[PDB]
Write an enzyme that holds these catalytic residues in place. Structure first.
Site, PDB file in Angstrom:
ATOM      1  N   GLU A  14     -33.556  -4.764 -18.908  1.00 14.25           N
ATOM      2  CA  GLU A  14     -32.572  -4.708 -19.990  1.00 14.25           C
ATOM      3  C   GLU A  14     -31.960  -6.089 -20.244  1.00 14.25           C
ATOM      4  O   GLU A  14     -31.934  -6.566 -21.384  1.00 14.25           O
ATOM      5  CB  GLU A  14     -31.476  -3.671 -19.711  1.00 14.25           C
ATOM      6  CG  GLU A  14     -31.900  -2.239 -20.017  1.00 14.25           C
ATOM      7  CD  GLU A  14     -32.266  -1.998 -21.486  1.00 14.25           C
ATOM      8  OE1 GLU A  14     -31.562  -2.524 -22.394  1.00 14.25           O
ATOM      9  OE2 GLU A  14     -33.258  -1.262 -21.731  1.00 14.25           O
TER      10      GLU A  14
ATOM     11  N   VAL B  24     -19.385  -2.449 -24.848  1.00 14.04           N
ATOM     12  CA  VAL B  24     -19.586  -1.422 -25.880  1.00 14.04           C
ATOM     13  C   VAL B  24     -21.053  -0.956 -25.897  1.00 14.04           C
ATOM     14  O   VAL B  24     -21.959  -1.776 -25.727  1.00 14.04           O
ATOM     15  CB  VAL B  24     -19.197  -1.972 -27.277  1.00 14.04           C
ATOM     16  CG1 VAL B  24     -19.411  -0.924 -28.369  1.00 14.04           C
ATOM     17  CG2 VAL B  24     -17.760  -2.465 -27.274  1.00 14.04           C
TER      18      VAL B  24
ATOM     19  N   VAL C  37     -31.844   0.359 -24.115  1.00 16.30           N
ATOM     20  CA  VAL C  37     -30.531   0.958 -23.830  1.00 16.30           C
ATOM     21  C   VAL C  37     -29.339  -0.043 -23.764  1.00 16.30           C
ATOM     22  O   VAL C  37     -28.184   0.388 -23.709  1.00 16.30           O
ATOM     23  CB  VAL C  37     -30.633   1.842 -22.548  1.00 16.30           C
ATOM     24  CG1 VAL C  37     -30.300   1.054 -21.285  1.00 16.30           C
ATOM     25  CG2 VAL C  37     -29.768   3.088 -22.661  1.00 16.30           C
TER      26      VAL C  37
ATOM     27  N   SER D 231     -24.705  -3.373 -21.746  1.00 13.59           N
ATOM     28  CA  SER D 231     -23.442  -2.729 -21.376  1.00 13.59           C
ATOM     29  C   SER D 231     -23.665  -1.581 -20.404  1.00 13.59           C
ATOM     30  O   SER D 231     -22.764  -1.253 -19.619  1.00 13.59           O
ATOM     31  CB  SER D 231     -22.707  -2.211 -22.609  1.00 13.59           C
ATOM     32  OG  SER D 231     -23.463  -1.217 -23.268  1.00 13.59           O
TER      33      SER D 231
END
Ligand code: D0K
Length: 187
Positions: free
Chosen positions: A28, A83, A86, A89
């Site tokens: 990510e 916020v 995927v 955050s």
């Protein structure tokens, strides 16, 4: 929001019990650096497996935005990290600790989070002649089970793939637990 992700980590990150989710957390973070490379601004990414159960991803791009909203008092960086491919955050929410260091417009900027919660505002920690973004995170041990340590060959395999799917970007992988190093780049 960050509480939802902590309540049902499996939904967001993948299986928390066989290491799939754990490694998706690295990917990510890397995806954002790769995006900075696709926009033309980052030439190299460095992924380091540290000996204290953290991974860091360092790019040489423009650096994450550091400005403040005057009325809100919150930095762009903090918005990005708090916020809801995927998103980072989620990684923040499932890390007992995460450190962000941004080199931008001549200054080093830094923020620490624990389980997604920032511990102080984004702050200047020095000067620099470079630009880029560094994210270093310690996965939460309340979340991940069985496989709680990063595994070189899982990252190596994926970081090679990304290297050849985004031709021109240099990706380096370094393991501090045994000095293993690799360099993935395709012409
Ligand atoms: C180790 C992980 N690397 C990393 O996060 N690199 C990075 C990200 C950047 N922006 C960004 C964009 C999207 C995002 O969430 C999907 C989170 C951050 C930006 C960025 O958008 N910088 C920027 C662009 C234009 C003006 N000012 C700063 C630069 N580098």
């Amino acid at each position: 929001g960050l509480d939802a992700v902590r309540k049902r980590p499996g939904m967001y990150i993948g299986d928390t019990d066989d290491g799939t989710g754990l490694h998706h957390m690295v990917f990510e973070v890397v995806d954002n650096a790769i995006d900075e490379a696709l926009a033309g601004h980052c030439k190299e990414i460095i992924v380091t497996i540290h000996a204290d159960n953290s991974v860091s991803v360092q790019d040489d791009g423009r650096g994450i935005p550091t400005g403040i909203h005057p009325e809100e008092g919150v930095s762009a960086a903090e918005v990005i990290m708090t916020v809801l491919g995927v998103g980072v955050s989620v990684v923040n929410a499932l890390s007992q600790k995460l450190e962000l260091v941004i080199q931008r417009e001549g200054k080093i900027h830094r923020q620490i989070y624990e389980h997604g919660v920032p511990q102080a505002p984004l702050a200047v920690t020095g000067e620099t002649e470079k630009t880029g973004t560094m994210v270093r995170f310690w996965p939460s041990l309340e979340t991940f089970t069985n496989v709680t340590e990063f595994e070189y060959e899982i990252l190596a395999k994926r970081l090679r793939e990304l290297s050849f799917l985004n031709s021109g970007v240099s990706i380096r992988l370094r393991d501090k637990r045994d000095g293993k190093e690799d360099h993935f780049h395709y012409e």
